[PDB]
Structure formats: structure tokens, C-alpha cells
Scaffold this motif. Structure first.
Motif, mmCIF file in Angstrom:
data_model
loop_
_atom_site.group_PDB
_atom_site.id
_atom_site.type_symbol
_atom_site.label_atom_id
_atom_site.label_comp_id
_atom_site.label_asym_id
_atom_site.label_seq_id
_atom_site.Cartn_x
_atom_site.Cartn_y
_atom_site.Cartn_z
ATOM 1 N N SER A 30 -1.504 10.096 -0.398
ATOM 2 C CA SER A 30 -2.244 10.185 0.855
ATOM 3 C C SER A 30 -1.316 9.794 2.008
ATOM 4 O O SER A 30 -0.478 8.906 1.845
ATOM 5 C CB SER A 30 -3.480 9.290 0.811
ATOM 6 O OG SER A 30 -4.182 9.334 2.042
ATOM 7 N N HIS B 287 0.805 -1.227 0.000
ATOM 8 C CA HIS B 287 0.000 0.000 0.000
ATOM 9 C C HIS B 287 0.840 1.280 0.000
ATOM 10 O O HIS B 287 0.351 2.341 -0.388
ATOM 11 C CB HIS B 287 -0.979 0.013 1.180
ATOM 12 C CG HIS B 287 -0.357 0.406 2.485
ATOM 13 N ND1 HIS B 287 -0.007 -0.513 3.452
ATOM 14 C CD2 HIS B 287 -0.029 1.622 2.985
ATOM 15 C CE1 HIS B 287 0.509 0.120 4.490
ATOM 16 N NE2 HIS B 287 0.510 1.416 4.232
ATOM 17 N N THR C 75 0.821 15.400 9.971
ATOM 18 C CA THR C 75 -0.109 16.533 9.952
ATOM 19 C C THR C 75 0.586 17.894 9.936
ATOM 20 O O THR C 75 -0.079 18.923 9.977
ATOM 21 C CB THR C 75 -1.112 16.487 11.126
ATOM 22 O OG1 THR C 75 -0.400 16.341 12.355
ATOM 23 C CG2 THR C 75 -2.081 15.313 10.961
ATOM 24 N N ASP D 201 -1.731 8.059 4.599
ATOM 25 C CA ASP D 201 -1.805 6.651 4.975
ATOM 26 C C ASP D 201 -1.043 5.736 3.995
ATOM 27 O O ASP D 201 -0.977 4.526 4.199
ATOM 28 C CB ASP D 201 -3.261 6.198 5.185
ATOM 29 C CG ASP D 201 -4.153 6.462 3.975
ATOM 30 O OD1 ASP D 201 -3.691 7.086 2.997
ATOM 31 O OD2 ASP D 201 -5.332 6.047 4.009
ATOM 32 N N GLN D 202 -0.455 6.329 2.951
ATOM 33 C CA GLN D 202 0.390 5.614 1.986
ATOM 34 C C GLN D 202 1.870 5.982 2.163
ATOM 35 O O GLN D 202 2.688 5.690 1.284
ATOM 36 C CB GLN D 202 0.002 5.963 0.545
ATOM 37 C CG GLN D 202 -1.388 5.546 0.073
ATOM 38 C CD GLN D 202 -1.709 6.126 -1.304
ATOM 39 O OE1 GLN D 202 -1.411 7.301 -1.604
ATOM 40 N NE2 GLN D 202 -2.315 5.308 -2.150
#
Lengths: 102, 4, 146
Positions: free
Chosen positions: A32, A4, A18, A34-35
Motif C-alpha cells: 500500500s 510501518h 498516484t 502509505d507503507q
């Protein structure tokens, strides 16, 4: 490196995902958070041989032993303050557009 | 009608 | 199709940039951060050059990827800066226009941003543009940026 993952981020002091400037760069790369896999130079050494993934190194002079497009910027504090460092980073990304924007 |  | 005119309450110049040009940087950044591809349509080549420099600095502490039309990656940068002579890259979501007169290509967009400058000598041009957006079937509104 998980399937991923689309970007490996390397720094001695890894920033929060963030962080608004980090967010901006990820948005520009169309990645993204989360990648993203964040690794210190120490952990990079532990990766399987022939690992492949696009990468972004921050304030790290030594190129990674990782296959894929490698962009390099100064430390985040320089990138946060310096318009020219940002323009140069975008230029790097553009040169490697085939890898980041397939 | 133009408001400026 | 929506056209929004931002009302400037000052004409304060900073770093060679008009008050409108300063506002353009803030709006382009906000729209790109919302997920949009942005076209900035400049009145002239020199203004495009000014904004190409400015968008690396304004807003501060921000990385807003952008290029002059014809430069950057295939399909153009997420924010592209064009001028009358220059063909722009397509597939863009919002037009931010600095053109002194209504541009026919504006009808290609469902969202347009325009401006009412503070200087009295520029008010007539702004009124003329507003009229032309109305004729072209745009839903019009005025706003103040925050």
C-alpha cells in the motif's frame, strides 16, 4: 525507517505515489502507498546503519546500503514506454518472491 | 433465448 | 455465479492479435486493478504465448503482472495464462475464457467472462457456449466493453 514501512523507493526525481504506473508496481508488490518511504540518494545516506527494508530503485545504478530485496528498474519514463523493461522488472520481483510475498 |  | 459475454463490433487485427485477444488484455488489466486474481483460459498454447507478450504492452503505460501457467511466483502470477494441456494455479476470482467450447472447470468460478466474436463463422460456437453456461446455472448477460 518506521516500522510501518514495507518498501523504500529511491530515485533522483521521486514520482508521485498516484502515478498510475507506480500504482501498478505497488499493487504487484502488494504494498500500500502509505507503507512506502520515498528517498533521494542523499537521504538514503542519512539512514541508521544496518537499516533493513525491501527497496525499488528507479534509474539509480548504485545498489543501496539497505538490507532486504532490492529490485532495480530504469527510469520511470523507460518503464512507461517499454514492454520489455516491465517484463524484466516482474522477473526481478519473481526471483525475490520470498522477500516480497512471504 | 440467445440475444445474438 | 455470473457469466458475461462481451459483444465485439469488429474483427480488426493488431500486432498479430485478434479483436477478442486485444479485448482480453483490457479486461484482464481492469479486473486485476480491481483487486482480483485472474485466469485467462486460452484455446491453445500459441494463443497463450501471444497474450503473454501482449499483456506487457496492452493496455499501454501499464504494469500488469502476469505469467504463463506453471511460471511466475508460488501460487502463480496475479494474472495467469493457461491452455488446455496446462494445469492452472488455484485461488482465482475471475475466469476470462477464449475456449471455443464451454470448459467444465468454469464452474469453479463465480465470475466468468466470455465473448461473441464479430465473424459470422464464429457465432454458432458462441451460441453453444451461452447455452452451456445456462445449463450449468450461471446468470447470463451480454455487454459492450467501454
Amino acid at each position: 525507517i518506521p516500522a510501518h514501512v514495507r518498501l523504500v523507493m529511491v530515485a533522483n526525481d521521486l514520482p508521485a505515489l498516484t502515478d498510475p504506473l507506480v500504482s501498478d508496481v505497488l499493487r504487484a508488490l502488494t504494498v500500500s502507498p502509505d507503507q512506502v518511504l520515498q528517498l533521494t540518494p542523499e537521504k538514503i545516506a542519512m539512514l541508521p546503519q544496518g537499516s533493513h527494508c525491501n527497496s525499488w530503485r528507479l534509474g539509480t545504478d548504485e545498489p543501496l546500503s539497505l538490507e532486504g530485496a532490492q529490485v532495480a528498474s530504469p527510469a520511470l519514463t523507460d518503464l512507461r514506454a517499454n514492454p520489455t523493461a516491465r517484463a524484466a522488472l516482474w522477473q526481478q520481483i519473481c526471483t525475490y518472491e520470498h522477500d516480497f510475498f512471504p | 433465448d440467445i440475444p445474438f | 455465479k455470473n457469466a458475461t459475454f462481451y459483444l465485439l463490433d469488429n474483427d480488426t487485427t493488431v500486432d498479430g492479435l485478434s479483436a477478442v485477444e486485444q479485448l482480453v488484455c483490457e479486461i484482464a488489466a481492469e479486473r486485476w486493478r480491481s483487486g482480483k486474481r485472474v485466469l485467462i483460459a486460452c484455446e491453445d498454447e500459441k494463443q497463450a504465448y501471444r497474450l503473454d507478450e501482449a499483456l506487457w504492452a496492452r493496455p499501454a503505460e501499464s504494469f500488469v503482472p502476469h505469467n504463463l501457467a506453471g511460471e511466475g511466483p508460488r501460487g502463480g502470477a496475479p494474472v495467469e495464462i493457461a491452455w488446455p494441456q496446462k494445469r492452472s494455479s488455484s485461488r482465482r476470482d475471475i475466469l476470462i475464457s477464449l475456449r471455443t467450447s464451454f470448459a467444465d472447470f468454469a464452474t469453479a468460478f463465480t465470475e466468468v467472462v466470455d465473448f461473441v466474436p464479430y465473424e459470422d463463422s464464429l457465432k454458432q460456437l458462441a451460441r453453444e457456449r451461452y447455452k452451456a453456461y445456462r445449463v450449468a446455472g450461471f446468470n447470463l448477460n451480454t455487454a459492450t466493453w467501454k
